Write a protein that binds this ligand. Structure first.
Ligand code: MET
Length: 531
């Protein structure tokens, strides 16, 4: 089936200013989308803010201003942050959006008409901070804003409160068997595999029904009224997850504003999501609740959920209160935007909780970006080595030559598979293995000596090196969007050859193609010292 490739980030709570986690989640969403665009597919990448709920309402009361004003301000900080980060997200959705509210009421009504919503009670623990229902097994003793004996979440250490309310209940218990068939029928639907095994384990045990409304007073009336019952507000998470459906139904003008909400998702060809990017902390909502609502509603399920780990800086937890900040915009202004993105995507894979340090950041920048990639691009474009500033016509290939060409021919297929898992770390590693090999070959052939000893041999070496750099750069273009463009400009690659699977093939740029012009004292990535 040919559709718009639909990739999403979570929509983030606006209780506080944007930080590394949100930037990271959205970066992953952005990269996946960028990769599919270079394959020449239609893409719709979505991000946004989760604006209702007790959490956010209470954060706005502590700042002493109205929820409308608070949400709008912090939403503006998220937008500015994501604009500053230089993503290519197609739409930014806000749950306060009036068209989103409409979609929630449709979905709610669908679940009701299906017989999957009844009036009951929830008597149990709740984490306001995580907007999450918890069982006694998932709580323990801790301390509060005072240092008094309270209870807290085992998942996140946030304070939990006991809740005893008449609530509308969704019949989650009835979807155990269908969710299990879904996980087994699609054994790559949740990534990484161990997180997938976690979900199955939990659903195997049993599922209780889920509260999907709350008494209106508890939410400080900052939520979507339940259709036909204004005493209840819709569960912030049922509201939030619906953003994926809403976004799938919004037509967006060139400027980025929503102009229209279609009746049927099939109209825009986006739903269901091909990949939901999320953090491990919200897996249950996406892998258990969401598919269950969708099955209830008769809507198609997503194809993949990819769930990633948390970040630390210098092996310490990130918190401005604890005196350990990690400002991405600041670190990007220092070391470069593409470099920072590279590091975040290279340093840790999804199954791990990565660790930033200035030490390790400078090591990768210098080692991989400058010494391996940058160095190689300057060599094959240098006036010393490439005396005509053109793509030379290759002569006969040696066996060594071919060993390298084979690695390059194989690289796209391999990088492709990793991008589609998705496993961006392994895609990057694959590309740089090929880059290390090209460097080894260039050291080995010593083209600088060939300039005078064997010009005919130089043509071959130089052509392979150029083509290896082009192909590796193309495949890195979702990771280094701006730098890939500089590289292609230096290689003088025509625009048409900078995307499309046609240009994954070795030899797509003809000999005779002219290099771009040099600039006095230019460098791709410049090295930073070890303080
Ligand atoms: C439907 S994704 C909701 C995610 C939630 N607002 C968070 O910040 O964790």
């Amino acid at each position: 089936v040919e559709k718009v490739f639909f990739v999403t980030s979570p929509i983030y709570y606006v209780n506080a200013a944007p930080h590394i986690g949100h930037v990271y989640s959205t970066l992953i969403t952005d990269v996946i989308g960028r990769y599919h665009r270079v394959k020449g597919e239609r893409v719709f990448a979505l991000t946004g803010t989760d604006e209702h709920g007790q959490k956010v309402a209470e954060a706005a009361k502590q700042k002493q201003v109205s929820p409308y004003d608070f949400t709008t301000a912090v939403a503006g900080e998220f937008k500015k942050c994501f604009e500053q980060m230089d993503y290519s997200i197609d739409y930014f959705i806000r749950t306060t959006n009036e068209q989103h509210k409409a979609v929630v009421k449709e979905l709610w009504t669908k679940l009701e008409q299906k017989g999957d919503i009844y009036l009951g009670r929830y008597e149990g623990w709740y984490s306001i901070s995580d907007e999450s229902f918890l069982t006694p097994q998932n709580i323990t003793d801790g301390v509060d804003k005072d240092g008094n004996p309270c209870k807290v979440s085992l998942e996140s250490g946030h304070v939990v409160t006991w809740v005893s309310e008449e609530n509308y209940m969704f019949r989650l218990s009835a979807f155990r068997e269908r969710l299990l068939e879904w996980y087994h029928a699609n054994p790559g639907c949740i990534v990484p595999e161990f997180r997938r095994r976690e979900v199955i384990r939990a659903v195997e045990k049993g599922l209780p029904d889920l509260s999907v409304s709350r008494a209106r007073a508890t939410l400080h009336n900052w939520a979507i009224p339940v259709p036909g019952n204004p005493d209840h507000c819709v569960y912030v998470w049922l509201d939030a997850l619906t953003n994926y459906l809403t976004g799938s139904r919004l037509r967006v003008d060139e400027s980025g504003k929503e102009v229209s909400l279609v009746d049927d998702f099939n109209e825009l060809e986006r739903f269901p999501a091909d990949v939901h990017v999320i953090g491990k902390d919200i897996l249950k909502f996406h892998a258990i609740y969401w598919p269950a609502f969708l099955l209830s509603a008769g809507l198609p399920l997503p194809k993949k959920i990819v769930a990633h780990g948390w970040w630390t800086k210098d092996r310490k937890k990130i918190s401005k209160s604890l005196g350990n900040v990690f400002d991405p915009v600041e670190k990007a202004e220092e070391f470069g935007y593409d470099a920072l993105k590279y590091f975040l995507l290279r340093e840790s894979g999804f199954s791990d909780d990565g660790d930033y340090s200035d030490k390790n950041m400078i090591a990768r920048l210098n080692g991989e970006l400058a010494d391996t990639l940058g160095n190689l691009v300057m060599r094959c474009t240098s006036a010393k080595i490439n005396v005509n500033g053109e793509w030379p016509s290759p002569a006969a290939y040696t066996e060594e030559d071919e060993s390298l060409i084979q690695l390059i021919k194989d690289l796209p297929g391999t990088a492709d598979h990793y991008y589609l898992i998705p496993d961006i770390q392994k895609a990057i590693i694959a590309v740089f293995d090929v880059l290390r090999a090209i460097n080894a070959y260039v050291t080995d052939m010593a083209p600088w000596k060939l300039v005078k000893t064997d010009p005919e041999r130089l043509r071959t070496v130089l052509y392979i090196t150029l083509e290896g750099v082009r192909v590796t750069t193309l495949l890195l273009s979702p990771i280094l969007p701006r730098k890939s463009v500089v590289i292609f400009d230096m290689l003088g690659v025509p625009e048409v050859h900078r995307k499309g699977i046609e240009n994954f093939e070795f030899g797509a740029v003809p000999p005779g193609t002219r290099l771009g012009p040099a600039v006095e004292g230019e460098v791709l990535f410049s090295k930073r010292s070890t303080e």
